[PDB]
Design a protein around this ligand. Structure first.
Ligand SMILES: [Zn+2]
Ligand SMILES: [Zn+2]
Ligand SMILES: [Zn+2]
Ligand SMILES: [Zn+2]
Lengths: 100, 67, 302, 283
């Protein structure tokens, strides 16, 4: 795996290392609490809600550090391909805040 | 009405803030009602740019070679 | 101005019920062979089934989906006194905690509007309407029992009020199926006072006596009144404007025609609350709409 | 192949080393400068002309790319100066001069441990710089290391931790070291089979074979291979490969530890390979 990393292939290093035997704060919309996960613990509900799509996000995502609005990854991929404003009308150019 | 609302949205209806009345040309074919609102809105808007205009003529001509 | 067409779905048994999700991209079909199927809609527009399993002992009358904001959940009702909640894991449709707590056969099963939780409204033939609640959205296996409703009649159809404003409490409409000569009522309307957590009686439509087979509320869309559909021998569209105990609705009657000459089985509205489709036992069905004079007229029977 | 590059320096060249990917090339020289090129597709381009370090530079050492773009550069001026690449520009980041005499050798530690740089100066001490975070460096010294002074250091591959390196100096004895549980860098062993002066030492990379191999180079000229495959007996058996006619300078291993390249005062570079019979032949 170290050799493959040196060569420059990062997918085939993960594929190889997959066989090794040994192992290696989103706000809720119902109670406004800091919940670590896809499901709340107080009201037992979905905490993350897609900012384009409004179907609850349980898998992969991305968001802006300051505005704190994001959703499904492909959704933002399409949205930010041609515009530069927060989709929920917040006013941040998240391309300048999310990407350092 | 639901079908009309679909074609209105596709043609960017209502978002032209440069000239207001041109909206009635985006609404579709012909509606005397909808070709009266935007003209009634355009004349109101180009008078605060040159606040009480929004009150309607009733409040204007109540508290009153012309005045 | 509706032009009919045909689809390319092939089945084996009869079809008893169909339903659409929220987006009109998936549907669930019943079949009197102890089987239900779901089909997706390919981008090109061709359909393809992707699920099939036996679910009960007998026949399944109804399947209704749920709001996607709680995932992908179904709700079936069968003849043999049962009412279950399906889920989906990805594929394989592993069934969650089926719950039957009635004595007779359950007549109908409809969900609740998404603005007040994940309630469910099973009703049985004996005249008992049951309310299920699940305050564990992260895991849909636990269901409680909120206020049940007793009317001491027969039950055929249930309907909610899709209104979402904070000026109208939830309302329940109930339909009978009896042919008894005791022609007193066929459709009652329930309400909800927030101060007692009970279910009182709002009004009663003492103007339909023949058996009712389906009741469908019209979507709100912001109007100042509500609309109901009653599927008797005559298709009827009522009107209630709340006046300013329960609230006093003042009923009316705005349409009553019989141009089907058969048993009008089911009625259901569209998304925008203008066109209403009506069915019957005369082969082909009709579409109703409202004209400039606000006098409802036929619109393209096909 | 070949990728000829013109240094455009004013004096001799003392060290040269490439990056971890095959894309950059750092050069020390005797003009108090360190020029970083960009050797891609034969290009002799320039990216930096870092200056300072009053004396003549002697060695360089790149860091693991997982920690960013860093570069250690020691010199005669008894100062180690460390570089970074912020916003596409190379700049001086930190200097340390806790050595009375010239610092001769620099060697980064294996990346599993972290970011540790071992520098052995000619005043008979080893200074270990640990990156403590938030732009802080912790320095732990080992006084009275060699009789005259250390010349070269090397780090052993990490196994399943026990940190361990190997230093050599002007006392003609190769020493081994180990970090205790508290943190004391206790000495473990010492090897003596050389005659004149050991200049460079190199420890072989591991690919899982239970065998540790260390090369060595002496001033008189002798490359001795110190095999040791006795697991936990901590016993080493010297061998020999040649006896040259000059001062052997540097020895370098391959990534799989099958070929050794030795360069000395003879102004030539030789390659070697172990045979089936156990003797080392040229190529
Ligand atoms: Zn919550
Ligand atoms: Zn989405
Ligand atoms: Zn925002
Ligand atoms: Zn932002």
């Amino acid at each position: 795996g170290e050799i493959l990393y040196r060569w420059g292939l990062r997918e085939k290093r993960a594929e190889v290392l997959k066989f090794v035997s040994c192992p290696p704060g989103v706000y809720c919309s119902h109670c406004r609490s800091e919940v670590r996960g896809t499901q709340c613990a107080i009201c037992k509900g979905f905490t993350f809600q897609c900012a384009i799509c409004h179907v609850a996000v349980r898998g992969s995502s991305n968001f802006c550090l300051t505005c704190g609005h994001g959703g499904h990854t492909s959704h933002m991929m399409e949205w930010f391909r041609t515009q530069e404003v927060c989709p929920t009308g917040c006013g941040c150019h998240c391309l300048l805040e999310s990407t350092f | 009405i639901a079908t009309k609302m679909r074609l209105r949205a596709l043609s960017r209806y209502g978002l032209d803030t440069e000239q207001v009345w041109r909206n009635h040309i985006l609404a579709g074919n012909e509606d005397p009602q909808l070709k009266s609102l935007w003209y009634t809105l355009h004349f109101m808007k180009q008078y605060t740019e040159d606040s009480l205009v929004y009150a309607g003529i009733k409040s204007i001509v109540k508290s009153s070679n012309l005045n | 101005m509706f032009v009919a067409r045909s689809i390319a779905a092939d089945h084996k048994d009869l079809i008893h019920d169909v339903s659409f999700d929220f987006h009109g991209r998936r549907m669930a079909t019943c079949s009197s062979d102890q089987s239900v199927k779901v089909w997706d809609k390919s981008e090109s527009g061709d359909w393809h089934c992707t699920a099939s399993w036996k679910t009960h002992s007998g026949s399944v009358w109804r399947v209704t989906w749920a709001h996607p904001e709680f995932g992908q959940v179904l709700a079936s009702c069968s003849f043999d006194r049962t009412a279950a909640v399906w889920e989906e894991i990805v594929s394989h449709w592993v069934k969650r905690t089926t719950l039957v707590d009635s004595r007779t056969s359950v007549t109908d099963v409809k969900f609740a509007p998404k603005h007040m939780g994940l309630m469910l409204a099973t009703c049985s033939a004996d005249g008992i309407v049951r309310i299920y609640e699940a305050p564990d959205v992260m895991n849909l296996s636990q269901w409680s029992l909120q206020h049940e409703i007793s009317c001491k009649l027969s039950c055929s159809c249930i309907s909610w009020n899709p209104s979402s404003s904070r000026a109208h409490s939830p309302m329940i409409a109930v339909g009978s199926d009896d042919s008894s000569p005791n022609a007193m009522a066929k459709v009652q309307i329930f309400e909800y006072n927030e101060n007692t957590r009970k279910y009182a009686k709002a009004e009663t439509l003492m103007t339909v006596t023949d058996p009712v087979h389906d009741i469908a509320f019209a979507p709100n869309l912001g109007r100042s009144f509500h609309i109901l559909a009653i599927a008797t021998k005559d298709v009827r569209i009522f009107t209630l404007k709340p006046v300013r105990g329960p609230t006093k609705f003042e009923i009316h009657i705005v349409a009553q025609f019989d141009n089907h000459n058969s048993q009008v089985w089911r009625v259901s509205w569209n998304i925008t609350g203008t066109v209403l489709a009506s069915s019957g036992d005369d082969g082909c069905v009709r579409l109703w709409k409202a004209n400039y004079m606000d006098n409802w007229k036929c619109t393209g029977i096909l | 192949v070949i990728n000829t590059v013109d240094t455009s320096h004013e004096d001799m060249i003392h060290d040269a080393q490439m990056d971890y990917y095959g894309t950059r090339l750092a050069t020390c020289s005797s003009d108090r400068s360190v020029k970083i090129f960009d050797v891609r597709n034969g290009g002799q381009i320039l990216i930096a002309d870092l200056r300072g370090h009053e004396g003549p530079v002697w060695q360089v050492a790149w860091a693991h790319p997982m920690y960013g773009n860093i570069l250690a550069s020691c010199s005669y001026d008894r100062k180690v100066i460390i570089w970074r690449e912020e916003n596409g520009t190379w700049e001086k980041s930190h200097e340390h001069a806790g050595h009375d005499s010239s610092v001769n050798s620099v060697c980064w530690a294996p990346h599993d441990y972290g970011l540790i740089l071992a520098c052995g100066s000619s005043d008979g001490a080893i200074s270990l710089l640990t990156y403590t975070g938030e732009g802080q460096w912790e320095v732990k010294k080992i006084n009275n290391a060699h009789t005259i002074g250390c010349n070269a250091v090397s780090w052993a591959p990490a196994v399943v931790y026990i940190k361990r390196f190997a230093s050599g100096g002007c006392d003609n004895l190769i020493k081994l070291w180990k970090e205790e549980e508290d943190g004391q860098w206790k000495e473990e062993q010492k090897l003596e089979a050389h005659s004149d002066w050991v200049r460079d030492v190199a420890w072989a990379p591991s690919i899982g074979l239970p065998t540790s191999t260390i090369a060595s180079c002496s001033q008189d000229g002798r490359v001795f291979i110190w095999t040791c495959d006795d697991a936990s007996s901590n016993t080493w058996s010297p061998k020999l490969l040649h006896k040259f006619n000059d001062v052997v300078w540097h020895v370098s291993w391959s990534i799989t530890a099958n070929i050794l390249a030795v360069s000395g005062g003879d102004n030539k570079v030789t390659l070697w390979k172990e045979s089936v019979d156990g003797q080392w032949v040229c190529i």
